[PDB]
Every structure is written in structure tokens, then in C-alpha cells.
Design a protein around this ligand. Structure first.
Ligand SMILES: O=C(O)C1=C(C(=O)O)N=CC(=S)C1
Ligand SMILES: [Fe+3]
Ligand SMILES: [Fe+3]
Ligand SMILES: [Fe+3]
Ligand SMILES: [Fe+3]
Ligand SMILES: [S]
Ligand SMILES: [S]
Ligand SMILES: [S]
Ligand SMILES: [S]
Length: 303
């Protein structure tokens, strides 16, 4: 009843006030369902650039909303919880980047998308887990500085054969610290299941999986693998996304993994956001201009 009210009022206010809702794959199912588009940060950013609308309600975490805003400076971007962020990303700082640039002056600074917008202004190129391998492959260098995620950096080193110098020391994602034993357990319980895990997972988990890929990659695997059952080693939000796309197959969480910050967004605070038209994502224009360069480098090296 209340969700029915909240859902209908959200759909009403989004229509009335000219907002497009963009939701990340890790949002709760109820917010994914009222979104105009659901996707990874790259898909959502690219999508934003194509919109005729000048108003965006973004449903994810701050670095993502800011990625949208940097590529769409003249659109009004709001979020329902202004504290939704990536705690581990904020362990990488400007001074660590400067320090490592000095020591390895010829190593391009490749920053993972979860990095703060301030940190992005000091990068040579941005990447996501979808494109990180391709991006580091096409750089001239045989050595790269990579942060903030150490597991993704080592994965990239593995697949490119390049030297990846990770920063900071011990940057990792709690959400993807799956037990390797959990894979052994599912392979006996579901013998024919395909295990897909995120490259942020530790090396023993990746190496025992049938596929390693980001959320965008995970959702393309059933387009080419006919298996009836997939075991999914990422954040719980992707199970709903996959089930919706491929109703014919079964998706089983490797374990329950919840990103607390992603779950800060609710139907209630989303409705408040459309009522009040807050909270606006504002970056100093200087940050937009400086962060935009390594982002455009990323597309140049992708496309
Ligand atoms: O690319 C994305 O949207 C992200 C993904 C993804 O796999 O799509 N995973 C983790 C983060 S922090 C962001
Ligand atoms: Fe995070
Ligand atoms: Fe993350
Ligand atoms: Fe993560
Ligand atoms: Fe997270
Ligand atoms: S995150
Ligand atoms: S992350
Ligand atoms: S994440
Ligand atoms: S997270």
C-alpha cells in the first residue's frame, strides 16, 4: 500500500517535474523498477549524455552521480542521500598520487571509477572494471600506477602482462571478499552452474570461477552461454537485474553481499528528492574541467 503510494507518487512527480531516473545495478529492486535506466556507471554516464532532458535523479553513490555531472555540466543532477559514497575509495588521496608520480614519472596514473572526483583531476586516465584491461592494454607504457583497488589492479596485470603499481597500500572492496569455499560448496550443490565473479574479488575466488567480469559484463554472459544456472559473486542488486533480463534462467548469489552505501537510497528519500528537488550534485567548475580530461581519454582508448 505505502510502496504503491510511494511508487505512484514518484512516477507522478518524475513526469510532472521533467526528471529522468538513472539507477545503478546495486540499487534495491524497488528503485531499479522505478528507474528509466538501470546500468553500470559507464552505461549510465553515456546514457546521460544522450538525454534531451536537463534533469536527472541519480540512484547510486556520489562518485557515480559526479561522473554523470562532469560529463553533463549543464544538467541538474540530484541524489536522495548526499552521504552515499565509497569509503574505501576515499583512502586514495592527492598526496599518495603525487608521491607515486614522482617515483615512477613514466607510469601513467590509471584511476578506477570509484576514486573521488578530486582524485580524478590528478589521473591520466579513468577506467571501470568493464574496460580496465582494454584501457591499460592500449596505453604506450608497460608500467602503470593503478588505484584505488588492488585486486582489480592485479587482475589487470594478469591479463595485460604489464606492471601495475597499486595505490594505496592494501586498497580492497569488502563487498567482494567472498570465501573461496563458497565456490567449492556451490559446485557440488549445482554441478552444472556457471560461476561468474567480479574482478574486485580476491585471486583465489577469481581463479575458481568460470567467468570474471564486471556487472555490465555479467549481464552479457547469458547472451552467449546457454546454461540454466549462474552463480553470481557480486553485490546482491545484480541478482534482480539479471533475473529481470533473463527470466528463463536461474541466478544464485555466491554469498549475500550488500553495499551499505548503495542501500542508503530508499523509496522514501527518493520521493523526498523529487518533492524538494534536492540534493543537487555540484562540483567546482575547475574540478569538472580537470576531471573531464582523463575521462575523455578513457573513451578515446575504448571507442
Ligand atoms: O562500473 C560500475 O558501475 C561499478 C561496478 C561494476 O561492476 O559495474 N562495480 C563496482 C563499482 S564501485 C562500480
Ligand atoms: Fe565502494
Ligand atoms: Fe564499489
Ligand atoms: Fe567494490
Ligand atoms: Fe559498494
Ligand atoms: S562502491
Ligand atoms: S569498490
Ligand atoms: S562495489
Ligand atoms: S562497497
Amino acid at each position: 500500500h505505502h510502496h504503491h503510494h510511494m511508487v505512484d507518487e514518484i512516477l507522478k512527480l518524475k513526469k510532472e517535474k521533467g526528471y529522468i531516473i538513472l539507477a545503478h545495478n546495486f540499487q534495491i529492486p524497488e528503485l531499479q523498477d522505478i528507474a528509466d535506466f538501470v546500468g553500470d556507471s559507464l552505461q549510465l554516464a553515456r546514457k546521460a549524455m544522450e538525454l534531451s532532458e536537463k534533469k536527472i535523479l541519480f540512484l547510486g553513490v556520489d562518485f557515480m552521480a559526479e561522473l554523470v555531472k562532469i560529463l553533463n555540466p549543464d544538467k541538474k543532477v540530484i541524489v536522495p542521500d548526499r552521504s552515499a559514497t565509497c569509503p574505501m575509495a576515499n583512502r586514495l588521496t592527492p598526496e599518495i598520487i603525487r608521491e607515486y608520480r614522482e617515483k615512477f614519472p613514466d607510469a601513467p596514473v590509471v584511476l578506477y571509477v570509484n576514486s573521488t572526483s578530486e582524485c580524478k583531476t590528478l589521473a591520466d586516465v579513468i577506467c571501470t572494471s568493464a574496460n580496465a584491461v582494454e584501457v591499460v592494454k592500449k596505453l604506450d607504457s608497460s608500467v602503470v600506477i593503478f588505484g584505488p583497488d588492488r585486486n582489480l589492479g592485479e587482475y589487470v596485470a594478469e591479463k595485460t602482462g604489464k606492471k601495475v603499481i597499486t595505490i594505496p597500500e592494501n586498497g580492497h572492496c569488502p563487498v567482494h571478499q567472498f570465501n573461496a569455499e563458497s565456490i567449492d560448496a556451490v559446485r557440488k550443490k549445482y554441478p552444472d552452474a556457471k560461476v561468474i565473479v567480479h574482478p574486485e574479488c580476491p585471486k583465489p575466488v577469481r581463479d575458481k570461477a568460470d567467468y570474471v567480469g564486471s556487472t555490465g559484463q555479467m549481464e552479457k554472459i547469458p547472451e552467449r552461454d546457454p546454461s540454466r544456472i549462474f552463480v553470481i559473486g557480486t553485490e546482491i542488486g545484480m541478482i534482480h537485474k539479471l533475473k529481470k533480463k533473463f527470466p528463463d534462467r536461474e541466478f544464485v548469489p555466491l554469498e549475500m553481499a550488500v553495499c551499505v552505501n548503495m542501500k542508503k537510497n530508499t523509496l522514501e528519500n527518493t520521493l523526498h528528492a523529487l518533492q524538494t528537488e534536492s540534493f543537487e550534485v555540484i562540483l567546482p567548475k575547475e574540478v569538472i574541467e580537470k576531471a573531464k580530461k582523463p575521462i575523455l581519454r578513457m573513451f578515446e582508448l575504448m571507442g
